Every structure is written in structure tokens, then in C-alpha cells.
Design a protein around this ligand. Structure first.
Ligand SMILES: CC(C)(C)c1ccc(N(C(=O)c2c[nH]cn2)[C@@H](C(=O)NC2CCCCC2)c2cccnc2)cc1
Ligand SMILES: CC(C)(C)c1ccc(N(C(=O)c2c[nH]cn2)[C@@H](C(=O)NC2CCCCC2)c2cccnc2)cc1
Lengths: 301, 301
């Protein structure tokens, strides 16, 4: 078991370089449209509080250098959708895959194809934190890189990277340009909320642990949703809905451990720590595997 | 910072399904040759101790079902190179990339494109353990999947997956069919050696930590290669050569921390533990990032 990302080829053929002035960042090229963050048009003079409708008026199609590999794309149109710029180009990407644009939920995971200058550099798995940040690995110029899921031959695009928040975490939008969370594409004082722990994900990781022969933390007891949740709010774990229990049905059925039985096991580790013990090679509780990531890794989808 | 894998598209176009009898596993299709493990030809009757030259004699080209996606490939030849079967087919893979075949060293890392039935399912980063095993995430039928590095446009193939060892770790070969380590493609009692810790890699991960503002473990002292190594053999850490120090030159120069200064810091954490503290979100010392992985992740190659 291990953090595992989707194969990235379907998405690598879509990454291009977008230049605007002396600003360079990554774009996503689907059919005849290049999606990139709209802060590409900011100059260092306007970053504190840019007027984007105004900044974009001063721009002309030929201020926008789009490069696919080493081919140069002809920008025949430019418009702004929320925080995303849509650059209409004259070629449709021959490598465009079947795709949809999805807004994901806090707790859900995706792969990230980290790019610089339109070239991929790496792929890794992320979760959307409950406070709508992502704990990424992104450098300067990683802007425009995308997060995605692949359900056989269909790429669901769900995240486009925009900024680092000075706290070291990352903020971005869906592919329609709406930020995840309260954040703005502006160099301004911005705070993420307090960041909680995705309980349903920690429970799935415990199931993965049991599936892989690591079972020391399994215990006697049961408990209820109500009583476990009330311990859960004390360690800043997210409330466990009844749907979360239902989402864990396949995992529970595969191990013979009922959901509330595993909760009772988790409730103990919260009040007691792991006391020098590991679980799946880790001394803390992991919360960035969904129950699907765990079923998928243990079913070889 | 994070375990980060190479973009996998160049390798996804090379994965095919190879069937032989009722055995199904993955093959690697480069130009007109499909590489796959030779244990594809084993029946459950011969697995305890197969005679492979003899088993292969009984086989004919048309016992070998090779499928590329849903295209069927015509096998016009079959031969055995060490533990690898080379199936000559009549089509050259149109998607063949620039590639070399490399045998890597214990300690070195690579990405794995985990496949089943010739279709990719996920990509993750691995290290070759000093005992020539890999701590993988592989299920039944993951045989034939490959490990690789990408140095701009050149895929270096370095690992092909063969078996799980009952201890839960994984064993395989280079693309010339020679096993890493003492292992044999035979259902027989096999033991990996005692598994040590890649010291040069742990030092690089400490540098990554310092580069990312996490510095609590940095200390006063220095030490020497000789004196640190002598603490190092006590915690089953690998000996630190002088080349390892030289390999750490770029990292040391970027942080202003000399190599032996960082060693003195590591020597303390060995004798004292992390005492509830984390480093880069981890409560143990990571040893599966090379100094290049750390420079690459902190330079955006
Ligand atoms: C104009 C605006 C919206 C303020 C902005 C400014 C810079 C960038 N950053 C570009 O690297 C970059 C590259 N090309 C254009 N911007 C980086 C970024 O967020 N620093 C923020 C850090 C402190 C708060 C102000 C900006 C970045 C670093 C690491 C990983 N991810 C992104 C992103 C957005
Ligand atoms: C014939 C030979 C060499 C003994 C062999 C037998 C089975 C396989 N395994 C196939 O899954 C598989 C699929 N198609 C053909 N074999 C699996 C495997 O290693 N079990 C070993 C476990 C105990 C020791 C005997 C075999 C496997 C599981 C998980 C991840 N990786 C591989 C590999 C090699």
C-alpha cells in the first residue's frame, strides 16, 4: 500500500506554455481552447489589487504567447470566466481526450500533473483539505497545472493551480474559474480556516491496514455514530455522517469488521496515540485516501 | 515536498497484455519486441521447480496471446533472455519512445507504472532496497509492469516486476532478465537479506526538510565520516562513502549546511529519536529520496 496516482499521459498531451508580457505559466489545451489562470496578465505593478476586467481590456490576442511543445499556437480570441482565462486558438488539440469539468468536495482526492513552462515534471496524489486548500508540491511557475481523476478513458478535470498561500499551502479553482474556498487571486492577507481531519478517509486507511495484515489496533468494542462523533469533535476530526458509513460498506464487508467497530478502534487511538507503533509504515493517521482509493488500490482498477 | 513520480505517458503506450495458456500478465512493447517475464509459461503443475528451457521448447509462437489495447499482435518469434521472454511481433510499436535499458544500484529510485491486463492502473515512486527487493504496491497479475526514469525524452527502463516474496516485498529483473538479488522465478523458500537504511538518502531528505523551513533537528556539532559511520553501523544504516558526501554537494551548498554538519545532526536523532516531533509530516526518517529526487523536486526539472 502506498499513495498512488493516475497514469498521466492523457493529460500530458494537453499541457502548453502560456506567456503574457514577461509572465510564463502553464495552460490546459482542450479542443480549441487554452485554459490558464487569469493572473497571467498581472504585472508586478498591479499585484496588490488588480482590476482584471480593466487589465484584460488593455490586452490583445497577440499579447498571449501560447506554445504547445515547441509549436506556437495562434490566439484568435480571449475571454475571462471567473478566475480563468479562456484563450481560443485556431488548432484543436489532436490529443484531446474525453473529458468533463467537475467541482470536487472537501475530502476528495485527485492526481496532480505538476508542470513548468508547459512541460510535465511529476505526478502525485492530493486531497482537497476540508478548508479548501491543498497540501501540494508546487514551485514558482507551477500555476496552471491541473488535478484530475481518470474513470476509464474519461479525464475529470477538477483543480487548476493558482497560488501559494504564505502558510505554504496551495489554492486554486475548478476549470470554470471559481476558487475553492474564500481565496482571491490577489497578493493580499489571506487565511485558510482551521484545518480538520477527514474522518471517513482515516477509517478507510485503517481498513487498508487491516487488509494488509496490520491489525494491532483492532479492539473489542463497538460504539455509535453519535458517541464516536462526540469524541471526534475533540480531536478536530470531521463529523461522520451516515453516508460515510454507507460509503465504507465495501471495505467493512471485505474484512468482516463493521463500520462502528472500526470507529471504536479509532476512538481509542485518538485518546491513546500509537505509542511508538506504526500503521502501514506511518506513525500518524493518514487522511488522504478515500474509501475508493483504498478499494481501487486493493482491487487493481 | 512529497513522493513524486515521473509523468508516465511515454510508458503507457508500451504496455500490452500477454497471455500464455490461461496465464495473463503484462508485457512491454518496444519496436517489434514484447518483453515479459518468462514465468508466463508456467502451469500450476510446474511452479515448484520449472525447467524453463524445456517448458519453452513445448511452446509455439501461437501459444502466446499478445494484445495491444484491443489490437491483437502477431507473434513471429519467441526466445528467452535470462528470466525474460522476448516475443518478436510483426508490428513495431508506433508509440515507441527513445529508451535505454539500465541496471540500477541499491538505493536508487524509479517510478512504477502498475498495470493489470496490459492497462495502466497507477504510478508511484519506489526505491531499490539495499537488499535488492522493492517495497511495492503490486497485486496478482501486476507481473510485467516496469520501473523507469525519464531524463528529458529518454525513458531508462530499469525494473520489470516478477514476484511477491511471501514476506510481502517484491522481486524482479532489469530488462535483460537478470534478477536484482538472489531471487529465482520459482515457488520456493526465498529470503531477502536483512534490509538496511540508505543513509545518503536520509541525509538528502534532511536537506529537503531544511529547504522547506523545518530545521529543529539542526545542531551545534560536526563529526567525521569515520566517526559518524561507526554510529551508523549500530542502527543498520549503510556506510557513508566519500562519494556520498560529494553527491550531497549541491544540497549542502544551497542551505549553507556542510555535509558532516548534517551528519552530526543525523547522528543525534539516531541516539535520541524524534520524541513526538515530525519532519516533513513524518514521524520516521525517510530513505527513498535520492539527492537527485530532492534537487529535482526543489528545482522543478
Ligand atoms: C498575482 C498573484 C495572483 C498574486 C500571484 C503571484 C505569484 C504566484 N506564484 C507564481 O509562481 C507565478 C508564476 N507565474 C505567475 N505567478 C507563486 C505564489 O503564489 N506566490 C504567492 C506567495 C505569497 C503571497 C503572494 C503570492 C507560487 C509559489 C509556489 C507554488 N505556486 C505558486 C501566483 C499568483
Ligand atoms: C510461477 C512463479 C514464478 C512462482 C510466480 C507465481 C505467482 C506470481 N504472482 C502473480 O500474481 C502472477 C500473475 N500472473 C502470473 N503470476 C504473485 C506472486 O508472486 N506470488 C508468490 C507469492 C508466494 C510465493 C509464490 C508466488 C504476485 C502477487 C502480488 C504482487 N506481484 C506478484 C508471480 C510468479
Amino acid at each position: 500500500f502506498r499513495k498512488m496516482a493516475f497514469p498521466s499521459g492523457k493529460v500530458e498531451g494537453c499541457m502548453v506554455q502560456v506567456t503574457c508580457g514577461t509572465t510564463t505559466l502553464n495552460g490546459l489545451w482542450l479542443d480549441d481552447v487554452v485554459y490558464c489562470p487569469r493572473h497571467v496578465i498581472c504585472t508586478s505593478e498591479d499585484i496588490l489589487n488588480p482590476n482584471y476586467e480593466d487589465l484584460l481590456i488593455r490586452k490583445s490576442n497577440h499579447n498571449f504567447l501560447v506554445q504547445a511543445g515547441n509549436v506556437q499556437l495562434r490566439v484568435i480570441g480571449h475571454s475571462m470566466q471567473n478566475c480563468v482565462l479562456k484563450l481560443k486558438v485556431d488548432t484543436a488539440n489532436p490529443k484531446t481526450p474525453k473529458y468533463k469539468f467537475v467541482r470536487i468536495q472537501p475530502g476528495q482526492t485527485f492526481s496532480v500533473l505538476a508542470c513548468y513552462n508547459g512541460s510535465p515534471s511529476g505526478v502525485y496524489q492530493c486531497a482537497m483539505r476540508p478548508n479548501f486548500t491543498i497540501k501540494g508540491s508546487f514551485l514558482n511557475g507551477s500555476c496552471g497545472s491541473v488535478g484530475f481523476n481518470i474513470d476509464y478513458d474519461c479525464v475529470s478535470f477538477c483543480y487548476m493551480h493558482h497560488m501559494e498561500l504564505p502558510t505554504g499551502v496551495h489554492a486554486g479553482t475548478d476549470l470554470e474559474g471559481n476558487f475553492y474556498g474564500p481565496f482571491v487571486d490577489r497578493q493580499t492577507a489571506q487565511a485558510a480556516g482551521t484545518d480538520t481531519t477527514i474522518t471517513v478517509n482515516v477509517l478507510a486507511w485503517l481498513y487498508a491496514a487491516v487488509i494488509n495484515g496490520d491489525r494491532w489496533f483492532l479492539n473489542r468494542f463497538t460504539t455509535t455514530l453519535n458517541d464516536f462523533n462526540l469524541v471526534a469533535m475533540k480531536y478536530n476530526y470531521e463529523p461522520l455522517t451516515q453516508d460515510h458509513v454507507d460509503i465504507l460498506g465495501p471495505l467493512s464487508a471485505q474484512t468482516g469488521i463493521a463500520v462502528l467497530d472500526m470507529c471504536a478502534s479509532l476512538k481509542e487511538l485518538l485518546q491513546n496515540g500509537m505509542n511508538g507503533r506504526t500503521i502501514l509504515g506511518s506513525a500518524l493517521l493518514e487522511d488522504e485516501f478515500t474509501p475508493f482509493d483504498v478499494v481501487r488500490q486493493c482491487s487493481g482498477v
